Amino acid sequence: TKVIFNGLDVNTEVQPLSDDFKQISDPKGYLTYSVKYEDQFTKASEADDRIVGPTVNLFK
Amino acid sequence: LSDDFKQISDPKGYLTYSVKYEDQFTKKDKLRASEADDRIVGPTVNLFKYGAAVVNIDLNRDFFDTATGIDLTKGIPLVQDLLVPIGVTAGAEQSAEYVSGLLMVLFKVMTDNRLVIVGETTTPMSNTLSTVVNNVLRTTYHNNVGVNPALLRDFTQVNWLNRDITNMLQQAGTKYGLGLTETRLDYVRLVKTIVGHALNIDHFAASVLNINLRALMEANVTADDRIKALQAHSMISTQFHGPNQGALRPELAFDHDHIIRCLMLAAANYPRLEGIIVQINTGYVASANVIRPVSEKRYFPENLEQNQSAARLVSAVKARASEADISSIHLAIAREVSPMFNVHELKKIAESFEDPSSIVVVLEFILFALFFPTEFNRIKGDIQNVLLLFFSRWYPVEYGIFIQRGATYTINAAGEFEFSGRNEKWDQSLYLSEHFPALFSDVPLAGANTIIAIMRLFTPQGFLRTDDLAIAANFPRASRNPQTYIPYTNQRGTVTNEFASRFRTIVATLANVVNERAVQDDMQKATRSCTKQWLRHLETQFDNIAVAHTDHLSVVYATMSNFMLNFTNNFSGNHATFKPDQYVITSPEGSYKPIIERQGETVDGLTIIDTSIVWPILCQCTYPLVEIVYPDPSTTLSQSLSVAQVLSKLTLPDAFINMILSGGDSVVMRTYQTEADDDLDEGIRMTTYDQYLSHIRERLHITNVPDPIYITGASTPDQIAASVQATHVAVVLYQSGVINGSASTYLRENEVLVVMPDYYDVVSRFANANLQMNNNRYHESVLEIADIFDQADFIQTSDAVRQLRALMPTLSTSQIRHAIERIAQITDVDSTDYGKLTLRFLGTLTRSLKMQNAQIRRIRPDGTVLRYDDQIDIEAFRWSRYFLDELRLRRLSVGLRLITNPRIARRFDGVRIMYLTDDDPDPDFVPDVPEGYVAVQYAHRLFSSSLANKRNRVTYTHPPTGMAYPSPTGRPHVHMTINERAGMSKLVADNIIASVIKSNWVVDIHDIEYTAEVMTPSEGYTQHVDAESIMTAPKGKLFHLQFMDGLLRPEPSAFDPPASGEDMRLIYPLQPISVARSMRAIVNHNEVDRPRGAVAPSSYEMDTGTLSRNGDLLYSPVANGQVGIPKLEVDHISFSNVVSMMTANIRTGDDMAVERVNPDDVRAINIRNA
Amino acid sequence: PALLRDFTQVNWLNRDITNMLQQAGTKYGLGLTETRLDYVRLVKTIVGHALNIDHFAASVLNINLRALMEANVTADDRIKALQAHSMISTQFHGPNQG
Amino acid sequence: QVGIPKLEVDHISFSNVVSMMTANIRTGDDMAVERVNPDDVRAINIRNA
């Protein structure tokens, strides 16, 4: 007794035959900005600071 | 009866009166009037109590109750579920929360459905009315009378108000009356008689109450319509009797067009639609009681099976034997006549034809074509693949010739089939293409004429019948000429069986394929005999089942073929030449979602058809062998009716959202002043090609005409008339050269739009004669409005939708689905999948739902778009926007008017702050900038940081001179205006406030759109802001400021302690914040003359205008000399008259009944009728 | 430094940003600068973004995704490579998603 | 003219386009088959061609 089945019935799983990449989803570069602050002279909106927040807070 | 209206007796209305009272301004002469003198002009006196500060109008707090997300607790229709953010939380407060709320108040007015019924009315007595309240009154008033500032003609105790209302009523301009009336539509009844009784509700509401009435009376529905709808769902040859056919209903007449466009739209985007349609009719087959599964199997065997030679034959016939499982058998039957939404193909049998038992697979395909033909044809390419494998592994020579002639062909050239000699394989990505399967074509070969015999063993048996019941019942059909294959006919001889005879020939004449196949093995010879016996038993099984199939079964199909939602014609009428037409939804803005298209099998297991179902339906099944139950038309009729209703709602949200963000007749033409003295008219109008592309091209094409002519290599100035006489629109499409000088004026002297590809200069193209028609007479950009056409069915929304698109922030895609999704839930309708397409092996894919202007136009094999080439597709598929196209769009035009009325444009922007030690008596007093104040426009870099004698004062550098200014005093005086109050910090903002206080500057904000509310002197200012925070506030957030009227605050006593330095006020609005008002300050002054300020109700809101000559509200009208200027389209809000009713109307009495006499003798129901 | 434009409280720098960034040639952008759709699905597949990162990293990332999306090979070809580890005649079926 | 490529030049650019792969596209996940068996081993033909 085989059942009527209107879809495709898969008995096997073929793995991904190769291995290369990995998925980072938030890439980070090889180079960065290092800031050295002068203590003298050193220590504005939701949608704005979500964007320019890190740039402003890094370069002040 | 259907129920598409909602009778509510005392109407509500869109615009109400919110009066802010004062408690300190009472009179001393109570005016006691007679009772009735009381009733008619009663509640209106207690809304204008003596000493009311301000009496303004706005959106109703009730209608758009928090239920529909509508929340105007401040004054603006504020929604919270619409154009929500994206990958972040919302802003405790957003403006955008206004251009979304104003788009939501336009939705509610459009989807309206109410029939003002007459109830409570009581006629008065001439003896019991002041002579003023009598001749206003038209015999009978409505008891629950509203307030109308004019009803108080003589009762207000405010002397100036009387002088003014009386001047306004008495001049003929506007005659106000309230009560019964004798409208033209006087005397009908539908079921109960319609009367036109004139109420005190705002005119949009009256316009919609009135439109809804006319639809319910305009449409003609005859108990006969319902009868026609039942014979379609009731099994063929049934007779329904009873109510006189032609007794009106009354319900909106089930529109056939509206439903078809919407069904097409739902198939394109809603996946489940195919499943829903399969679900109604699989339920019908189950109901119908016509196949069943029994526990015993008596298939192949033929008596004796269970012998070793037979073991090999047996095993082959048992791999292929599905278990009869009730709900899959019904599904096979219900694919047979149901729409196919994404092409589907067999669950493949990879069997290689190495033995006589592979005759079994061929035979299952033969059986499959026999029993279901439409269905066989969709997947016939796959069958051709596997059948080809059998043809070679088994008929080598023949196949070699047949394959060489070509395995596929495309039939065109106005007939005839061309086979391209390449053996490929079907696959199905090309089901929808122009490729046929060579094997199924049937044209005879030369050498391989034997393969052409087996190929003519699969051919559907029954006739293709045009389905008259459904065409008679206004069912929605895409085909334009509906047919359906039937497949088995129903017997004619005493003992003959046409169907069984055909199967006997197939299972015998074809066998020669088992008794003539060269096996090369001992025992494969044994199997060959076992297979011939299996073919012989199998044909006897077929006789018993053949009668059950050709009598009852055909009849079920015949009925079902013309059900309401089985709406394509899928017929493989003929295998040799059928492609399923195919419409696509292509729009001008670049969206293309085809209606029927290929994809791997989807989640609900509807998509892939296992082809082995044929065996259980021939061997483990019992029919009602010749008792028979016929099923009510009613179950499915209602089932499908509700499904059409449900479909309308899903589709309504999506259609409406993008109808708003799709212009909607806005072309935005610019007119250029060919020099001279100008006007802001004159000009020569260009339209950027794309505006013309979408709007113009589509409208123009459909009223078939030749594409406005191109302009140059030379001139024509004449031939512009040649091409505009011919093309009816007068748009002229541009091109190379400099427009001829004599003919430039022809264009500017005939208003022909000129479409331009771009406008780098309008001047570079035009050959200016002399008058700097270019950038010297600054062009002027306005809105075209599609009145060039002059249409009916084409031209639907006005330019209101335009202003509406212009308000809303540019949406992305997830954002359009977000806003659309919110609207789906806001209306108690779930749209779990829309647009997206869910599949089994790739997870759920989501498509954008923005189809701006889409039209159902057929796409021709290449995937390209055809025209509305007539004679191939139906009418209702020529044009519309996706709305009810009758009731909805009319409602939407009135909604559009409401959404653009500027007594609702109450989220104002730009507030100017200037510190003046003065006071005013009201709101909206934008103090004008003085004399010498110079306009340094606030940039960001003229506010530096110098050292003015021992500190680091923030310093301003004036721009008209150079000077410094390192401290806010004695500056230069500067109508400075900010814009991007963005970067700014503190320091500079503390400095500009300092400077607008100590140096008398008049700074100015612009991007701070707020909502104001004028609140009256007696009390105070409740919510109090401060400049530290009006600069240090965010950007798309509408904060709420409130100015004070202060015109109704008596004086100080004669004998009191002076003052000393009183205060003024830092911020003012920089527009007029009293856009909704009506009367202001109603307390006479001294005792007989109007306190300075006081405003009396704009004479336009107390003029119960007449009823149009064919429809809607009209002025008094005017001049007392002639016509009537409609309320809608005029600009001003007024209190007019809706046509009412009397019936509880749905209480007709008894509902229509139908004693439906059956067909009675099932082997006689004449299916045949072409 | 480009996002530091107009949000900086020092004037000379804000000037050098604003008129250094305002000419032909240099212009800054941040967001989704590319979208490409599947042909038979019509669902977006490879979207380009303009990030703020350096050009060595972004170069290498683009090398990798150019590898995949320039190869024009789906998993059905792993069905072939599997067809070599089955016996001789073994028919694999499966979902076709390119 | 044409854009100048960022690598062939000796200075650094801290904002530039990364071609990114959406949630619809997926790699490295295993597929589904459905590996029909050969049936009768005797009838397997491994020879020409």
From TrEMBL, chain B:
It holds the Pfam family VP1-like_C. InterPro entries: VP1/VP3_C, VP1_protrusion. It comes from the Viruses. Coiled coil: none annotated. Residues 665-796 form the Inner capsid protein VP1 small protrusion domain. Residues 999-1139 form the Capsid protein VP1/VP3 C-terminal domain. This is VP1.
From TrEMBL, chain C:
This is VP1. The lineage of its organism: Viruses, Riboviria, Orthornavirae, Duplornaviricota, Resentoviricetes.
